Write a protein that binds this ligand. Structure first.
Ligand SMILES: CC[C@@]1(O)CCN(c2ncnc3[nH]ccc23)C1
Length: 167
């Protein structure tokens, strides 16, 4: 039993809600919140820009030190950093950005990072400003993640379409 509330159950291990992931994180304070990161951990917009703003830019300061030490992530890769005021940890996961020409096949690799964590709050990888089809992202999530994932979908219209079209 966990403290996630109001989710629709899609499968044995995947749940979905129409919610602002920032507000969800502030309420639940989960062990792991997933960020829709880029390889440079530049949290300018989308989910990443919103999560960083909620940390008063502390996520960005920590991220800049991480990159200065380690260099960029791989597309499809991840790193674990602090969750600041939002969660214990933030798993920064890089899904392919279709608006940069990146291979959508890497979306499965991106979701595989979730399997290293028993429970996660997360957005749909590569959705939104990353330019991929959120319906496809949901399918890859369900077919790849085996740990317990609570998906927050900000857009109500998109949330309704994802549920109604789910197979
Ligand atoms: C579906 C693809 C998105 O890029 C569009 C909206 N995104 C979010 N999802 C959940 N919580 C969020 N807070 C701020 C943005 C945001 C994901």
């Amino acid at each position: 039993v966990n403290s996630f509330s109001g989710y629709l159950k899609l499968t044995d291990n995947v749940y979905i809600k129409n919610a602002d992931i920032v507000e969800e994180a502030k309420k639940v304070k989960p062990t792991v919140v997933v960020n829709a990161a880029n390889v440079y951990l530049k949290h300018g917009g989308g989910v990443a820009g919103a999560l960083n703003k909620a940390t008063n830019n502390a996520m960005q300061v920590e991220s800049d030190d991480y990159i200065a030490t380690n260099g960029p992530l791989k597309v499809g890769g991840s790193c674990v950093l602090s969750g600041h005021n939002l969660a214990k940890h933030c798993l920064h996961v890089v899904g392919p950005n279709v608006n940069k020409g990146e291979d959508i096949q890497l979306l499965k690799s991106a979701y595989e990072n979730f399997n290293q964590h028993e429970v996660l709050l997360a957005p749909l990888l590569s959705a939104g400003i990353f330019g991929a089809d959120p319906i496809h992202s949901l399918r890859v999530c369900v077919d790849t993640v085996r740990t317990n994932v609570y998906l927050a979908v900000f857009d109500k219209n998109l949330y309704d379409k994802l549920v109604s079209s789910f197979l």
